[PDB]
Design a protein around this ligand. Structure first.
Ligand code: ATR
Ligand code: ATR
Lengths: 286, 286
């Protein structure tokens, strides 16, 4: 099954190159189009227009900045009836649900994607894509698309599920954890200790974190938050002492302050004697 | 060189077992002492008293709850002159600096340690210990102690350096990042998406985080925060949109809120067009 890609940015380009290597015939389009020139040389067909790119293939993969631009570009096709549209842009769950419904009312099939991978990672081990929406669609494009990522997974029937997980993992987890590390290193530097002496431990701490994340998920699935060892109360106390150390050292320590606040509410609602994972129970706004 | 361990808790016990396996003669003491019974069977000598345990060995490794208890126990020796004292308790840098000075005034040598490893990890790959204080001491105990952790490192002349790095990595980074993951999963669940569909990506995200941490450290060492790709401004905007999504979904999102605040201050102080690592520059209380 041939495919066309709308968007030859870094990601779009990477998608196109992986698909060529798969042995798939690829047509590309891009709003500028100088950008798509090199892809021509690798085996791709450059199209004059979205309409023309859409018409060329049964499967259209979108890699454009956002959902609004995606909508505007695919509006320029007169017909998409019978086509499979796969939109790999990041965005809100609502964006996905609405895009899905618009696609469906034009007589096209839809699947929504979210890419956890730098462009340069796209053909390799260090690359995953989550997909959500109609499972029948996923079944029809799995073999064609699974090549372009090591770990490709259908994560739910809701069009917006991939976008929810991507926000959660890239935003709520990853970006915040990256910030936490800035607070950490700024703290070390404030105590006149060499930031370099953090370096050799990094992999030990990210390994430990991975094992803990697995364990937190098991506990969130279970409702089993029971002791083991350090309780919420112990953690709350330890975090307060860390916060005070960081402040005495001249750091605002805002993430550490927010963490303490999460821990206290968990304790203050009677979970003080359960394990740290029980902190999940008071993250809601109530 | 024989060693005595004060404290046969889980950690103390683990230290003792590794040292026996090293081929070192070990004497142990513990305040209760039923606890130390099994260690007898593995090859260790149980001592009646701290004084007696101290007298038995040139090198004393402390694994007691905190610095206060450590001080009180070693006060019970009449003499420690000429002994090497290695205190592996976690605590503040000030605790370390003061303990160091007290040890020195009793005519003993000192090194301070911080253990990044669960007890069960102590003899294995997944285990590191940082040491700080007098480098001459480290040189004299390196071969004897390096066995009991895969990655053992001297991290500075300040007695308190190991305690600073441990607070930074265990507290400011790790505990907060673990909290961030609770916010993430609570968010996914709030959007009626299966928390299970986070699981398969975990290792990809902790791998990506590790590479990013390395890169942040390189940038903190350099002062080179320059573009590349996504700027502080883009991040601030993306984080606001994540925060709004999480709140609309009924989550407090306190860590995400604190992260945004860090990002805005960086932008609001004219770093908006540099890369994310420039956020380090406004973490101070000012
Ligand atoms: N307003 C718009 N209309 C149509 N396509 C747009 C667009 N804004 C961005 N794109 C496309 O969306 C894709 C995303 O590009 P980007 O600037 O976000 O980064 P990158 O090139 O790294 O992917 C590109 O294919 C881009 O095409 P251009 O080369 O014409 O910029
Ligand atoms: N007040 C105190 N005086 C002396 N030793 C103490 C102490 N509190 C704790 N310890 C020791 O400090 C060590 C830390 O024990 P812990 O209760 O913190 O956890 P774990 O047993 O997992 O290491 C133990 O060797 C403990 O000895 P006990 O078996 O007598 O509890």
């Amino acid at each position: 099954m041939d495919v066309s890609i709308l968007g030859t940015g870094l990601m779009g380009t990477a998608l196109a190159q992986a698909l060529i290597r798969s042995g798939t015939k690829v047509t590309v389009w891009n709003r500028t189009a100088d950008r798509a020139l090199p892809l021509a040389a690798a085996g791709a067909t450059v199209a004059e227009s979205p309409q023309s790119a859409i018409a060329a293939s049964p499967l259209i993969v979108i890699s454009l900045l956002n959902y609004e631009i995606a909508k505007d570009v695919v509006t320029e096709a007169d017909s998409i009836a019978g086509k499979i549209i796969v939109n790999t842009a990041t965005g809100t769950p609502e964006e996905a649900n609405q895009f899905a419904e618009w696609i469906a009312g034009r007589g096209a099939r839809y699947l929504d994607g979210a890419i956890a991978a730098y462009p340069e990672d796209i053909g390799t081990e260090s690359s995953g894509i989550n997909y959500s929406g109609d499972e029948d669609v996923w079944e029809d494009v799995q073999s064609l698309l699974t090549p372009i990522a090591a770990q490709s997974r259908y994560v739910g029937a809701r069009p917006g599920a991939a976008n929810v997980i991507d926000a959660a993992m890239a935003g709520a987890f990853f970006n915040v954890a990256l910030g936490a590390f800035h607070e950490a290193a700024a703290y070390v530097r404030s105590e006149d200790v060499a930031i370099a002496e953090m370096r050799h431990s990094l992999h030990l701490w990210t390994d430990k974190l991975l094992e803990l994340l697995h364990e937190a998920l098991k506990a969130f699935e279970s409702g089993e938050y029971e002791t083991d060892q350090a309780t919420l109360n112990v953690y709350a106390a330890a975090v307060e002492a860390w916060q005070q150390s960081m402040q005495r050292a001249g750091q605002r320590a805002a993430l550490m302050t927010a963490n303490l606040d999460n821990l206290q509410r968990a304790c203050a609602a009677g979970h003080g004697d359960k394990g740290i994972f029980a902190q999940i129970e008071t993250l809601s706004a109530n």
